[PDB]
A paper describes a structure:
Template-independent terminal ribonucleotide transferases (TENTs) catalyze the addition of nucleotide monophosphates to the 3′-end of RNA molecules regulating their fate. TENTs include poly(U) polymerases (PUPs) with a subgroup of 3′ CUCU-tagging enzymes, such as CutA in Aspergillus nidulans. CutA preferentially incorporates cytosines, processively polymerizes only adenosines and does not incorporate or extend guanosines.
The other crystal was CutA in complex with an A3 RNA oligonucleotide, which was obtained by soaking crystals of apo protein crystals with RNA. This structure was solved to 1.9 Å resolution and refined to an Rfree of 21.3%. In the CutA–A3 complex structure, the 3′-terminal nucleotide of the RNA occupies the position of the incoming nucleotide. Therefore, it represents a product complex that forms after incorporation of the nucleotide but before translocation of the RNA to allow binding of the next incoming nucleotide. In this structure, a single Mg2+ ion is observed that is located closer to the position of the divalent metal ion A from the canonical fully formed polymerase active site. This metal ion interacts with Asp341 and the phosphate group between the last and penultimate nucleotide of the RNA. The base edge (imine nitrogen N1) is hydrogen-bonded with a side chain of Asn397. The third nucleotide of the RNA in the CutA-A3 complex (nt −2) is located in a narrow cleft between the finger and palm subdomains.
Author numbering: 245 to 598
């Protein structure tokens, strides 16, 4: 019984002003960079997961796999981590995302799973059967983990494997992405479902797109690197290049530090990127126009971020015009603070009004 709209309609829908480029700081001073760098690695160390909690995620997987195969024997039911839990970007307070696979299609009834998990002591058990991807949500009070589960959405397993591959290519990607994600949680702009802002997966695509567009690039366009694609276990070629040992080091030509990349990330999205004209596409690794995708007609197209496996889908579709204006303001707010090295203020915890 509470409204979670992050960006109030009183914000309006107007485009932000194009700032005189000579007034937009182009690089960190040496003092600001050095201190921001040490602050970011201190933040990253606190964000890194601990082994005790990582063990709890795997125990939840095992517990769930046992519950399911005991209740419905014979169907080779398997339980897989994905999302943050499988792409190297989770922290200890990250929820668990789980994909349950089986050829037994009758398991795709998420409320049947809710009844079983409730009966065996899970708490806050809810099922959402009308979502694009039906889910069951639980709180495990023994392991103290929140968990969203779906059944047989293998597409999410592949784009998790893709993000994991991107994270594995250059060692700056994991700390950069974790710190930006932490920023999105603290400013509460990571809630596409109820807040009208952007999903964590949308944010990760924006980070990867920015890194692909650096000169030199930090990350390649994996979907376009046909010669480094391996054959998967199902016999088909991978959709994206995934021979990690051959890919590792691709970004080594780019010599910018973590501090400079965080500054440039916010500078890019605060002032450089023309939201009105372009679509970000980590599938291509280059900018696309909205018009070449017919996305000038798309409802909720202020921000266009192409899903790399279904390029008909805009990940930015959860932000209407008002929400985009507030997101853009948050990105400029972040740029102004990181330009002066103020990582703590940048990550101030947003609280909803009463
Ligand atoms: Cl993630
Ligand atoms: Mg989740
Ligand atoms: Mg529009």
């Amino acid at each position: 019984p509470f409204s979670r709209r992050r960006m109030p309609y009183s914000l309006g829908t107007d485009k932000l002003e194009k700032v005189d480029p000579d007034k937009i700081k182009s690089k960190l001073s040496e003092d600001v960079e050095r201190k921001l760098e040490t602050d970011m690695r201190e933040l990253y160390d606190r964000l890194l997961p601990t082994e005790a909690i990582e063990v709890n995620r795997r125990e939840l997987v095992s517990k769930l796999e046992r519950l399911f195969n005991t209740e419905w024997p014979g169907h080779d039911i398997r339980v897989h981590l994905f999302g943050s839990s499988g792409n190297l970007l989770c922290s200890d307070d990250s929820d668990v995302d789980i994909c349950i696979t089986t050829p037994w299609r009758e398991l795709e009834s998420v409320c049947m799973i809710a009844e079983l998990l409730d009966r065996h002591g899970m708490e806050k058990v809810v099922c959402v059967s009308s979502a694009k991807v039906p889910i069951v949500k639980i709180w495990d009070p023994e392991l103290k983990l929140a968990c969203d589960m779906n059944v047989n959405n293998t597409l999410a397993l592949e784009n998790t494997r893709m993000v994991r591959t991107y994270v594995s290519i250059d060692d700056r990607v994991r700390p950069l992405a974790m710190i930006i994600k932490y920023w999105t949680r603290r400013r509460v702009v990571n809630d596409a479902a109820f807040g009208g802002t952007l999903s964590s997966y949308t944010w990760i695509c924006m980070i990867i797109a920015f890194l692909q567009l650096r000169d030199p690039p930090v990350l390649p366009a994996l979907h376009q690197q046909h010669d480094l694609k391996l054959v998967k276990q199902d016999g088909a070629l991978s959709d994206f290049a995934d021979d990690i040992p051959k890919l590792r080091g691709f970004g080594a030509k780019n010599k910018d530090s973590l501090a400079v990349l965080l500054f440039q990330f916010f500078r890019f999205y605060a002032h450089e990127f023309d939201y009105d004209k372009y679509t970000l596409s980590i599938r291509m690794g280059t900018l696309l126009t909205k018009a070449e995708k017919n996305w000038q007609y798309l409802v909720n197209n202020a921000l266009c971020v192409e899903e790399p496996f279904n390029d008909g889908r805009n990940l930015g579709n959860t932000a209407d015009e008002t929400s985009f204006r507030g997101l853009h303001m948050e990105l400029r707010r972040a740029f102004d603070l990181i330009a002066e090295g103020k990582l703590e203020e940048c990550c101030e915890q947003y609280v909803f009004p009463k």
